[PDB]
Amino acid sequence: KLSEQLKHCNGILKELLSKKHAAYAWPFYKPVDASALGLHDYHDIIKHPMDLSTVKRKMENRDYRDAQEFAADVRLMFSNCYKYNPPDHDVVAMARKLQDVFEFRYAKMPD
């Protein structure tokens, strides 16, 4: 965590990693293993990979200085999914659902 707004961000992160959302969050838990998934163009198309384990390490290391920096990494993770995948792939449906969880709770940021 860190500041009051970063504690709200840390709360969101814990929720995104929780059993509550595991049915659609699991593709975002760890970095995409492009080689393992046969996605040999992944790193040509996605210049800045991002995933929830990386967000968690950056939060634990007090890398994020504000909520905006945290949100930019979470949205980068979703954007990468929308950029690489055809819009009818199950992983895109899962990204949309997890981003809905993220955006509605991020909007409840304490001022």
Binding site for ligand UL5 (CB under 6 A): 27-28, 32, 37, 39, 81, 84-86, 89-91, 94
70 vs 78 by CB, closer to ligand UL5: 78
Rounded to a whole number of angstroms, the minimum distance from the CB of residue 90 to ligand UL5 is 4
Convert 36-104 into a string of H (helix), E (strand) and C (coil). HHCCCCHHHHCCCCCCHHHHHHHHHCCCCCCHHHHHHHHHHHHHHHHHHCCCCCHHHHHHHHHHHHHHH
Rounded to a whole number of angstroms, the minimum distance from the CB of residue 19 to ligand UL5 is 18
Rounded to a whole number of angstroms, the minimum distance from the CB of residue 21 to ligand UL5 is 14
